[PDB]
């Protein structure tokens, strides 16, 4: 049977909609199933072309937890699913970024990324502790790399389990977009990654 998708990625597009994307290591296509974590009716999207690995889901309820499951299908049958639980949080003093009124959350991921540009070549990144880590938190791995590819990544190890964690990142070329990734290291392993791209102006 088809392999399990190797990656499942979520991006909030608004308070009630998100993009779900996945990666597979021929196929008829994929199924994307989602439902409220507690008792909701099951919604299944059949994706007919193996080359389409993303879909937009709309009409989600704000501040409600949803479970998403993605599987591939072939002639030999359905493969195993990759699963993620996601909430889009929004209101019922920070720099008003477009899309700041809503954030994605999952229990084991670091909180939303908050960036402070300290100078043309330096910034500080901060994030809230995962609300429900799998095991106790030992620290965080933070990676920084040029978003347009090419160069190497820089990996910072942030030790400890503070309610809020912070990292100052120096040596950033001016006006260059950088991709940041944050994930918790726990006694059970690595949690989900939170990723975003910034550019210091």
């Amino acid at each position: 049977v088809p392999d399990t998708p190797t990656r499942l990625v979520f991006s909030a597009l608004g308070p009630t909609s998100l993009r779900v994307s996945w990666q597979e290591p021929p196929l008829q296509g994929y199924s994307v199933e989602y439902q409220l974590l507690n008792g909701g009716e099951l919604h299944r999207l059949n994706i007919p072309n193996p080359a389409q690995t993303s879909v937009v889901v709309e009409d989600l309820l704000p501040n409600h937890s949803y479970v998403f499951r993605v599987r591939a299908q072939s002639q030999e049958g359905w493969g195993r699913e990759r699963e993620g639980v996601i909430t889009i949080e929004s209101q019922v003093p920070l720099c008003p970024l477009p899309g700041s009124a809503f954030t994605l959350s999952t229990p084991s991921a670091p909180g939303p990324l908050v960036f402070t540009a300290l100078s043309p070549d330096s910034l500080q990144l901060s994030w809230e502790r995962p609300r429900r880590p799998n095991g106790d938190i030992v620290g965080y791995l933070v990676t920084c790399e040029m978003a347009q590819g090419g160069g190497p990544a820089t990996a910072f190890r942030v030790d400890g389990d503070s309610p809020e964690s912070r990292l100052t990142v120096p040596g950033l070329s001016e006006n260059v977009p950088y991709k940041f990734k944050v994930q918790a290291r726990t006694t059970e392993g690595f949690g989900p990654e939170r990723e975003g791209i910034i550019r210091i102006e």
Partner: peptide, 24 residues
């Protein structure tokens, strides 16, 4: 790709970030 512009001296800025399960 989505790039979030940061302004020096605007202070803490919440950006939109993706959550990924698994490995890239």
């Amino acid at each position: 790709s989505n790039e979030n512009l940061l302004l020096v001296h605007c202070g803490p800025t919440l950006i939109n970030s993706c959550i990924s399960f698994g490995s890239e």
